[PDB]
Write a protein that binds this DNA or RNA. Structure first.
Ligand code: K
Ligand code: MG
Ligand code: MG
Ligand code: MG
Ligand code: MG
Ligand code: MG
Ligand code: MG
Ligand code: MG
Ligand code: MG
Ligand code: MG
Ligand code: MG
Ligand code: MG
Ligand code: MG
Ligand code: MG
Ligand code: MG
Ligand code: MG
Ligand code: MG
Ligand code: MG
Ligand code: MG
Ligand code: MG
Ligand code: MG
Ligand code: MG
Ligand code: MG
Ligand code: MG
Ligand code: MG
Ligand code: MG
Ligand code: MG
Ligand code: MG
Ligand code: MG
Ligand code: MG
Ligand code: MG
Ligand code: MG
Ligand code: MG
Ligand code: MG
Ligand code: MG
Ligand code: MG
Ligand code: MG
Ligand code: MG
Ligand code: MG
Ligand code: MG
Ligand code: MG
Ligand code: MG
Ligand code: MG
Ligand code: MG
Ligand code: MG
Ligand code: MG
Ligand code: MG
Ligand code: MG
Ligand code: MG
Ligand code: MG
Ligand code: MG
Ligand code: MG
Ligand code: MG
Ligand code: MG
Ligand code: MG
Ligand code: MG
Ligand code: MG
Ligand code: MG
Ligand code: MG
Ligand code: MG
Ligand code: MG
Ligand code: MG
Ligand code: MG
Ligand code: MG
Ligand code: MG
Ligand code: MG
Ligand code: MG
Ligand code: MG
Ligand code: MG
Ligand code: MG
Ligand code: MG
Ligand code: MG
Ligand code: MG
Ligand code: MG
Ligand code: MG
Ligand code: MG
Ligand code: MG
Ligand code: MG
Ligand code: MG
Ligand code: MG
Ligand code: MG
Ligand code: MG
Ligand code: MG
Ligand code: MG
Ligand code: MG
Ligand code: MG
Ligand code: MG
Ligand code: MG
Ligand code: MG
Ligand code: MG
Ligand code: MG
Ligand code: MG
Ligand code: MG
Ligand code: MG
Ligand code: MG
Ligand code: MG
Ligand code: MG
Ligand code: MG
Ligand code: MG
Ligand code: MG
Ligand code: MG
Ligand code: MG
Ligand code: MG
Ligand code: MG
Ligand code: MG
Ligand code: MG
Ligand code: MG
Ligand code: MG
Ligand code: MG
Ligand code: MG
Ligand code: MG
Ligand code: MG
Ligand code: MG
Ligand code: MG
Ligand code: MG
Ligand code: MG
Ligand code: MG
Ligand code: MG
Ligand code: MG
Ligand code: MG
Ligand code: MG
Ligand code: MG
Ligand code: MG
Ligand code: MG
Ligand code: MG
Ligand code: MG
Ligand code: MG
Ligand code: MG
Ligand code: MG
Ligand code: MG
Ligand code: MG
Ligand code: MG
Ligand code: MG
Ligand code: MG
Ligand code: MG
Ligand code: MG
Ligand code: MG
Ligand code: MG
Ligand code: MG
Ligand code: MG
Ligand code: MG
Ligand code: MG
Ligand code: MG
Ligand code: MG
Ligand code: MG
Ligand code: MG
Ligand code: MG
Ligand code: MG
Ligand code: MG
Ligand code: MG
Ligand code: MG
Ligand code: MG
Ligand code: MG
Ligand code: MG
Ligand code: MG
Ligand code: MG
Ligand code: MG
Ligand code: MG
Ligand code: MG
Ligand code: MG
Ligand code: MG
Ligand code: MG
Ligand code: MG
Ligand code: MG
Ligand code: MG
Ligand code: MG
Ligand code: MG
Ligand code: MG
Ligand code: MG
Ligand code: MG
Ligand code: MG
Ligand code: MG
Ligand code: MG
Ligand code: MG
Ligand code: MG
Lengths: 71, 51, 64, 75
RNA sequence: CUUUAAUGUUUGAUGUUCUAACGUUGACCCGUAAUCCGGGUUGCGGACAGUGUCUGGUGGGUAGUUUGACUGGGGCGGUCUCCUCCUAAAGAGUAACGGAGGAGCACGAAGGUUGGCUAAUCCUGGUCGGACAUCAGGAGGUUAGUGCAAUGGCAUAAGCCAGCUUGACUGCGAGCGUGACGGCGCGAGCAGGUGCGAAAGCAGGUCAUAGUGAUCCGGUGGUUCUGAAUGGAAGGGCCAUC
RNA sequence: UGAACUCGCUGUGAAGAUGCAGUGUACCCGCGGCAAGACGGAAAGACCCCGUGAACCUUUACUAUAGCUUGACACUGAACA
RNA sequence: GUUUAUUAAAAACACAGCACUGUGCAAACACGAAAGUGGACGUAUACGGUGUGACGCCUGCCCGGUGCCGGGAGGUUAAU
RNA sequence: UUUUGUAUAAUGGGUCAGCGACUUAUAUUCUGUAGCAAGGUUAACCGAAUAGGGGAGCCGAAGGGAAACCGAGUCUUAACU
RNA sequence: CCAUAGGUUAAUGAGGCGAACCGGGGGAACUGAAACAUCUAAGUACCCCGAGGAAAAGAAAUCAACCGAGAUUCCCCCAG
């Protein structure tokens, strides 16, 4: 019941808010997944505020380089 | 047969131990070697004990 | 019907990234005091399955 | 019969020969006693196995008072 | 505490008795033209016997099965794993119910390391002292010794004494050897922490090659792991070991 | 009953030849006879071995189990020692 | 007398007789989840099982082993 | 046919005609091929026409570790040139 | 003695047959495990009983995870 969210498939939800339930409705991760993680898969453009998801050190650099905040 | 096996247990530290063989009939006293404990990371007096 | 995995095989092998399988070494359950520590050290880490006995593993667990 | 037993064969002998390039660690001779001896840049393990201690070409020599065979390496 | 007396109070194996459960393949009556069955008076048994559930024994009466392979046909005999020599044709490997022998351990010093030593068999001479104890010399040159078979080795000794000791250490491991594989072996160097030596260094068991068994299933101690709602816990896992 | 234009010998040969080699001999075809050969016909050898085959039988082979047998509890109560 | 219908008629089986042994009658035993039958409408001079095999002369020794019978102290011992 | 080996005197067949043995379904892997490609694809289902919906889901684009967990790294170990 | 057992006729119903499907009561073995006994085959074949046009189930002393759902049955995934 944990997921491994590829950074490329992140700006595909609701502007720039990726809680978990929003990320689930985008069909990125399964329904019975309460913990999730954003890894450095590459390529971000828009600023995405990642609230609730555990974020990787490599992705924290990228997401903030694009403009998006975390928590 | 004959020569049984023993458990050399550490004094100062965690319950880490070595195991060796020993002839109990010929040598009725107990061993007291000074071997290396890797949990403490130190050479310590290891005393003989049973399994 | 679906292929049933040989469950015992599923519990002793794990699929690596390239395709091969890691497995735990034999001779590290009991009768350890007579074994030299250099053996026991070398048998501790997981190891890859050889190309001879790979096809037997690939057959008995087709899923992963 | 009374007998008919035998041990498994031990694959002992000169693995790498004279003039052959070897890497550091390469076993040169597996044997029982010191039929060959350790010369320059060659070790001699508990099994009396002669192994290369440096990358080079193997060299067999016959040198000493008692006229023994030595294995050396020269880079 | 020991040792024991009188009274209260704790149950349960006894041994008779008692009758109402239960038994009657006793007598009589009725349903009824009826040795069945039922019901009714009785008489004898009587809380036993008998039946149900547990349980220990016994159980070829019955049932399901197993009862190896090699093999100069099968049986009988022998053998099956491991090490050494030859067979083996000067790399490795190489068969036969070919030829000969061993192993299933030992060891806290018989390991480590610093310092020293050098052996069999003689011939002489010498108290008992002999064919042979111990001493002294010579001649010998490893003919010995090596914890155990054999082969290969050992004087720089790996043989023999001696002093300090625990490297029979934990984490690794460039690279090789040998395996169909499971595996098996060798290994400089590195990190930590040790012995020994003034140091150079040596030491990850023992002159080397036998002394051994996979998995599964459990046992024991540990643990920065898991912990079926949540905290724990049990059970797992991982280490070490049986 | 594979199909035959279906001889002897000595050899040769998956090792005992009508069929191959070399030889010898023999017009073609019936009928009655005899049974040496066609490893003649008959039954996927019954001996023997094999198969991690079967069945039955045996027993102090293993595992069970009906039966028998022992207790406990139940049906099952009441006084007195 | 009986027997391998169909390769064995015998020395095999049975047999009268003999002994052991069980069984007190709701008998032992047998068929049957049981009810119930048979044994037997019999009752130890009876019934079942086992061996032996008319008759005559006989039937010796051993109870360590295995079974059976009895004994009950001690040891061991299930469920509960 | 079976075999080291068969004219073999080893197997099978008197002949003819007809029938007589690698299939099917579902999963899985690989090859060719076609579509679309960091995406690809839908199942049951509704619909009535093999279309069209339906993306529930599955596989891929991230791995290491027994696991927590970390993540282009990670496990190993006090740490690893 | 009282009643009960029993005996009489009447009212209504049942009885037997039938393909599968259905729910219950019983319930194998060959086979696979390269032998075999746990296990498998499999609650399968078969036997029996009782239905109905369907039968069973069925309106939570059910899940879930601090969020939520809301009887049952059936299909597709979850997932070999
Ligand atoms: K060969
Ligand atoms: Mg989805
Ligand atoms: Mg990082
Ligand atoms: Mg110290
Ligand atoms: Mg992968
Ligand atoms: Mg290795
Ligand atoms: Mg899958
Ligand atoms: Mg041999
Ligand atoms: Mg050998
Ligand atoms: Mg050999
Ligand atoms: Mg072998
Ligand atoms: Mg060494
Ligand atoms: Mg009475
Ligand atoms: Mg009375
Ligand atoms: Mg009566
Ligand atoms: Mg009457
Ligand atoms: Mg009358
Ligand atoms: Mg009568
Ligand atoms: Mg009566
Ligand atoms: Mg009555
Ligand atoms: Mg009655
Ligand atoms: Mg009566
Ligand atoms: Mg009385
Ligand atoms: Mg009783
Ligand atoms: Mg019993
Ligand atoms: Mg018995
Ligand atoms: Mg039997
Ligand atoms: Mg049977
Ligand atoms: Mg059998
Ligand atoms: Mg058998
Ligand atoms: Mg047998
Ligand atoms: Mg045998
Ligand atoms: Mg045999
Ligand atoms: Mg043979
Ligand atoms: Mg044989
Ligand atoms: Mg023979
Ligand atoms: Mg034999
Ligand atoms: Mg040779
Ligand atoms: Mg050779
Ligand atoms: Mg050669
Ligand atoms: Mg060979
Ligand atoms: Mg021997
Ligand atoms: Mg030992
Ligand atoms: Mg000493
Ligand atoms: Mg030394
Ligand atoms: Mg001289
Ligand atoms: Mg010698
Ligand atoms: Mg010798
Ligand atoms: Mg030494
Ligand atoms: Mg020495
Ligand atoms: Mg000191
Ligand atoms: Mg000391
Ligand atoms: Mg001291
Ligand atoms: Mg050791
Ligand atoms: Mg070794
Ligand atoms: Mg450090
Ligand atoms: Mg250091
Ligand atoms: Mg010191
Ligand atoms: Mg010092
Ligand atoms: Mg130093
Ligand atoms: Mg040394
Ligand atoms: Mg030694
Ligand atoms: Mg030795
Ligand atoms: Mg050895
Ligand atoms: Mg096993
Ligand atoms: Mg376990
Ligand atoms: Mg326990
Ligand atoms: Mg703890
Ligand atoms: Mg950790
Ligand atoms: Mg917890
Ligand atoms: Mg926790
Ligand atoms: Mg905890
Ligand atoms: Mg749950
Ligand atoms: Mg809560
Ligand atoms: Mg909990
Ligand atoms: Mg708390
Ligand atoms: Mg635990
Ligand atoms: Mg455990
Ligand atoms: Mg770990
Ligand atoms: Mg001939
Ligand atoms: Mg001819
Ligand atoms: Mg000719
Ligand atoms: Mg002629
Ligand atoms: Mg004629
Ligand atoms: Mg005739
Ligand atoms: Mg004939
Ligand atoms: Mg014939
Ligand atoms: Mg045959
Ligand atoms: Mg026979
Ligand atoms: Mg036979
Ligand atoms: Mg067998
Ligand atoms: Mg076999
Ligand atoms: Mg038994
Ligand atoms: Mg009682
Ligand atoms: Mg009671
Ligand atoms: Mg008759
Ligand atoms: Mg007659
Ligand atoms: Mg007759
Ligand atoms: Mg007859
Ligand atoms: Mg007849
Ligand atoms: Mg007949
Ligand atoms: Mg006859
Ligand atoms: Mg006759
Ligand atoms: Mg007659
Ligand atoms: Mg006769
Ligand atoms: Mg007779
Ligand atoms: Mg008499
Ligand atoms: Mg009598
Ligand atoms: Mg009976
Ligand atoms: Mg009765
Ligand atoms: Mg009668
Ligand atoms: Mg007789
Ligand atoms: Mg007389
Ligand atoms: Mg007698
Ligand atoms: Mg007696
Ligand atoms: Mg007596
Ligand atoms: Mg007896
Ligand atoms: Mg008795
Ligand atoms: Mg008795
Ligand atoms: Mg008693
Ligand atoms: Mg008693
Ligand atoms: Mg007792
Ligand atoms: Mg007791
Ligand atoms: Mg054939
Ligand atoms: Mg063939
Ligand atoms: Mg054949
Ligand atoms: Mg043949
Ligand atoms: Mg022919
Ligand atoms: Mg030919
Ligand atoms: Mg023929
Ligand atoms: Mg022939
Ligand atoms: Mg012919
Ligand atoms: Mg034949
Ligand atoms: Mg044949
Ligand atoms: Mg044929
Ligand atoms: Mg024929
Ligand atoms: Mg096929
Ligand atoms: Mg697929
Ligand atoms: Mg592919
Ligand atoms: Mg593309
Ligand atoms: Mg699309
Ligand atoms: Mg439809
Ligand atoms: Mg929808
Ligand atoms: Mg849509
Ligand atoms: Mg959608
Ligand atoms: Mg792929
Ligand atoms: Mg890391
Ligand atoms: Mg670290
Ligand atoms: Mg009527
Ligand atoms: Mg009417
Ligand atoms: Mg009816
Ligand atoms: Mg009806
Ligand atoms: Mg049904
Ligand atoms: Mg039915
Ligand atoms: Mg049914
Ligand atoms: Mg049932
Ligand atoms: Mg079976
Ligand atoms: Mg069977
Ligand atoms: Mg089987
Ligand atoms: Mg089989
Ligand atoms: Mg069998
Ligand atoms: Mg049923
Ligand atoms: Mg039926
Ligand atoms: Mg019915
Ligand atoms: Mg209808
Ligand atoms: Mg109707
Ligand atoms: Mg209904
Ligand atoms: Mg209902
Ligand atoms: Mg209800
Ligand atoms: Mg209600
Ligand atoms: Mg309600
Ligand atoms: Mg409700
Ligand atoms: Mg709410
Ligand atoms: Mg809702
Ligand atoms: Mg739901």
């Amino acid at each position: 019941i944990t997921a491994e969210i590829r950074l490329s498939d992140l700006a595909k939800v609701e502007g720039g808010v990726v809680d978990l339930n929003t990320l689930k409705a985008a069909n990125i991760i399964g329904i019975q997944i309460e913990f999730a993680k954003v890894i450095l898969a590459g390529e971000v453009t828009t600023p995405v505020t990642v609230r609730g998801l555990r974020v990787t050190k490599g992705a924290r650099a990228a997401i903030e380089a694009a403009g998006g905040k975390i928590e | 047969g004959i020569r049984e096996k023993i458990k050399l247990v550490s004094s100062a530290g965690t319950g880490h131990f070595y195991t060796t063989t020993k002839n109990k009939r010929t040598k009725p006293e107990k061993l007291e070697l000074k071997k290396f404990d890797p949990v403490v990371r130190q050479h310590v007096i290891y005393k003989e004990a049973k399994i | 019907p679906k292929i049933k995995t040989v469950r015992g095989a599923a519990k002793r092998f794990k699929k690596t990234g390239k395709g091969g399988f890691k497995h735990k070494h034999a001779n590290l359950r009991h009768i350890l005091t007579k074994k030299a520590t250099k053996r026991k050290r070398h048998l501790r880490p997981k190891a890859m399955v050889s190309k001879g006995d790979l096809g037997l593993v690939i057959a008995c667990l087709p899923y992963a | 019969t009374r007998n008919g037993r035998d041990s498994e064969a031990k694959r002992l002998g000169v693995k790498r020969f004279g003039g052959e390039s070897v890497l550091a660690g390469s076993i040169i001779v597996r044997q029982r006693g010191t039929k060959f001896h350790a010369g320059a840049n060659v070790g001699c393990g508990r099994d009396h196995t002669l192994f290369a201690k440096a990358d080079g070409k193997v060299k067999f020599e016959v040198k000493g008072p008692k006229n023994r065979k030595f294995i050396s390496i020269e880079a």
